[PDB]
TrEMBL record, chain B:
The gene is pilA2. Keywords: Cell outer membrane, Membrane, Periplasm. This is Prepilin-like protein. Disulfide bonds join 67-91, 140-155. It is found in: Cell outer membrane; Periplasm. One of its GO terms (cellular component) is periplasmic space.
């Protein structure tokens, strides 16, 4: 009985991992785009802005999820019109009959600047649940941001506005 | 483009190291052992009609109340005493996996939201650059056998977890 539950738990974890891996890879994806693309983030050659640029999906997920926020003028022209429209922030995948809830979101406030979390929960039909997360920062894309070339990191104060929370045991 | 390939491989390796450590530390949180009725670490009797028989002990309780600092449980769990939490657990540390340091931390969460929740968080930092941070959230409901109404262990009673730490966050600050 212990054995059977342990097997279901192992499977729930494997289902969780496969969704966490795929959704995290989306956050870290980049693409080469022309200088006319609204989704450009950094030029391949800083001395040739008329040439190709790299575009990081990190920026699209960070500012779109769970709700759309305009970036600072330093990223995507400060406009939500220049975030990719095709994206899904959350959902449920079924992996060998195991439902896995998943969510991608940017963090907010100064602490959340340039951070995206990916969180999954697999709920095995026979009981066991497994919840996994991955924390991705703007520094984790390739190539690495530098002082001179900060994208896809936002400038200070250029992330998602702080949502606010006041917790206390007295409450 | 060489560098891109190399860094992707190092990132894959960093992820594998993080997973290994996350699995080992999460398994520790979920571990149980059979103990006699006289054990200070007893949580639930194996037979609900025979408390004189053997008991199950959940390490979940030890990690939840010991990490990152030791807090006394409520009188319903471990006799309400830090003396009845297992000594010599490690809450945090660094493991090196094929030359990749992995920071790891187990802790109970606090306040009403944190009641009966333990997090396990790891960060693998590849010497050549790539970092990978993974977490697992474990609740008292995830042990085997599952807690029930008539047998809640290792879940604390309402108000019987780690006291809330407090945090006042606001963009005005």
């Amino acid at each position: 009985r212990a054995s059977a539950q342990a097997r279901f738990a192992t499977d729930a974890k494997a289902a969780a991992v496969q969704v966490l891996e795929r959704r995290s890879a989306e956050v870290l994806k980049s693409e080469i785009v022309p200088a006319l693309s609204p989704y450009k983030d950094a030029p391949l050659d800083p001395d040739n802005p008329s040439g190709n640029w790299r575009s990081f999906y990190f920026v699209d997920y960070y500012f779109s999820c769970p709700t759309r926020v305009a970036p600072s003028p330093k990223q995507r022209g400060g406009s939500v019109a220049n975030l990719r429209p095709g994206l899904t922030c959350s959902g449920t995948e079924t992996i060998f009959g195991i439902p896995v809830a998943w969510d991608i979101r940017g963090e907010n406030g100064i602490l959340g600047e340039g951070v995206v979390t990916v969180v999954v929960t697999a709920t095995h039909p026979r009981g066991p649940k497994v919840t996994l997360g991955r924390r991705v920062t703007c520094y984790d894309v390739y190539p690495s941001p530098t002082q001179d070339q900060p994208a896809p990191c936002p400038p200070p104060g250029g992330g998602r506005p702080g949502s606010g929370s006041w917790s206390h045991p007295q409450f």
